[PDB]
Design a binder for this molecule. Structure first.
Ligand SMILES: NC(=O)c1ccc[n+]([C@@H]2O[C@H](COP(=O)([O-])OP(=O)(O)OC[C@H]3O[C@@H](n4cnc5c(N)ncnc54)[C@H](O)[C@@H]3O)[C@@H](O)[C@H]2O)c1
Ligand SMILES: NC(=O)c1ccc[n+]([C@@H]2O[C@H](COP(=O)([O-])OP(=O)(O)OC[C@H]3O[C@@H](n4cnc5c(N)ncnc54)[C@H](O)[C@@H]3O)[C@@H](O)[C@H]2O)c1
Lengths: 246, 243
């Protein structure tokens, strides 16, 4: 637990869904965790005195920087997990009109720009730490199988997640000399509030034929933290599903 | 992992040995399947057994699986046996020999399929524990994606391992058997029997992989029910250049 015990993690989207499960796994591994989210202070307040909540939109650099002052005050920042995100499902062409430009921009801004914003500012905080052996820290991003298998309606969602995939390797290369790994998880179908018919959804997953449990995402995050050789890679976490057009 | 039986090919050396040790530490009984290494495996204690077999020999592999089945329910199969190769397509002394290409494909690709298919037959006979009967983990290589000059046969064999991962996961899904492939980058094993400068080319960590890091990923795959039908590069972010 070298990069968690006595260290600080920042989890965006950490008050719900995949981020909440990750927060819990990190706390169980001994880290202090700053949850960065639009909302969820009550949930995070039930997680004990090693968790803190920072209200911030990941697309707002001043709010993210303020959250990172809090994180730094707790100890050396060594883990950043980008789970904040949203989706839409809109056809390119419809009788109602063309996919609105502002809707495409919004999804790209939150999912792609917001991830880069927290990554770049978080990397600055990790880079100033003393190495523990050969490592300063690790940044984990959330893409989606939609980066590869995008369905009808997913133009903006897939663009945003494809951007997260595409930037993983250059950022890993860029941060390598500072001893910061960068890895991306591409989840398949998980039982989170994002899916707020769910049973028939899970039947389409080859095996296990169910929605993913958010704790399985958190477990993979922890393995990435603990495995020094995982870097510059995207890992599908998806029960072998491949998403069909519909 | 406890109470279950695992089979590790290539388990007497390198990545397979580190995997065997991790599985034994997790409480499993392990049958090591290898061309040699009785002495190495004898030092691993009572929960490890050695079965001599060429992975391309279906009778010898079946005999190893009979031993495994006699210990308990077979739930984990790890394919680490393999060999490397570096021959140019054209060179002064002639064309890459067809027999050399066949040999690497036979050991690395056909041998992996042989152990996978016979291992799956044993896993499928077990009772599920919750939602799973077992998991099969294969070893590809970054050469499946980044093949260098000289690697025509090695990359062909490892690209075949990658290509068959999804259809086999789909095929075995109703029997509750996951299939995942690891694609290692550069690891400090007897396969590499100059190494310092090789490690310097890995972005981060800038060293050869420790076989235990491969074993750790194997154990995570076993413990994470959602990993299935996927290939995972384990490589320090390296991308192999032509030379
Ligand atoms: N659940 C799935 O099936 C699934 C599949 C593929 C990818 N994902 C991705 O996983 C990540 C987590 O989603 P989830 O399923 O946990 O959903 P979720 O809605 O439960 O959690 C997302 C969290 O992000 C927060 N958030 C949203 N926009 C934000 C912003 N601008 N700034 C700060 N916080 C913000 C939300 O308030 C929420 O707490 C997302 O990136 C999502 O796209 C989820
Ligand atoms: N070491 C690396 O840098 C590296 C990189 C990418 C992939 N790999 C792959 O990882 C796997 C493990 O290799 P390693 O590095 O541990 O090498 P290794 O030589 O240390 O171990 C391989 C083992 O497989 C056994 N073996 C070979 N052919 C066999 C056969 N026909 N039947 C049974 N056993 C056989 C050998 O006796 C040996 O014990 C191989 O598939 C290799 O191609 C290794």
């Amino acid at each position: 637990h070298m990069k968690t015990k006595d260290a600080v993690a920042v989890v965006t989207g950490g008050a719900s869904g995949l981020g909440l499960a990750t927060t819990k796994r990190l706390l169980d591994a001994g880290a202090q965790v700053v949850v960065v989210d639009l909302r969820g202070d009550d949930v995070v307040g039930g997680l004990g005195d090693r968790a803190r909540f920072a209200q911030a939109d990941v697309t707002d650099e001043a709010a993210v920087s303020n959250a990172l002052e809090l994180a730094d005050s707790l100890g050396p920042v060594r883990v950043v997990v980008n789970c904040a995100g949203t989706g839409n499902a809109i056809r390119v062409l419809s009788r109602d009109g063309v996919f609105p430009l502002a809707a495409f921009r919004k999804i790209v801004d939150i999912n792609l720009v917001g991830t880069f914003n927290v990554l770049r500012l978080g990397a600055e905080r990790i880079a100033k730490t003393e190495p523990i052996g050969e490592e300063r820290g690790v940044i984990i991003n959330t893409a989606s199988v939609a980066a590869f298998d995008g369905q009808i309606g997913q133009a903006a969602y897939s663009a945003s997640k494809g951007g997260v995939v595409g930037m993983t390797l250059p950022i890993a290369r860029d941060l390598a000399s500072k001893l910061i790994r960068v890895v991306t998880i591409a989840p398949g179908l998980f039982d989170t509030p994002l899916l707020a018919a769910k049973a028939s959804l899970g039947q389409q997953v080859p095996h296990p034929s169910r929605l993913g449990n958010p704790d399985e995402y958190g477990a993979l995050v922890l393995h990435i933290i603990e495995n020094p050789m995982l870097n510059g890679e995207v890992i599908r976490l998806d029960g072998a599903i491949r998403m069909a057009p519909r």
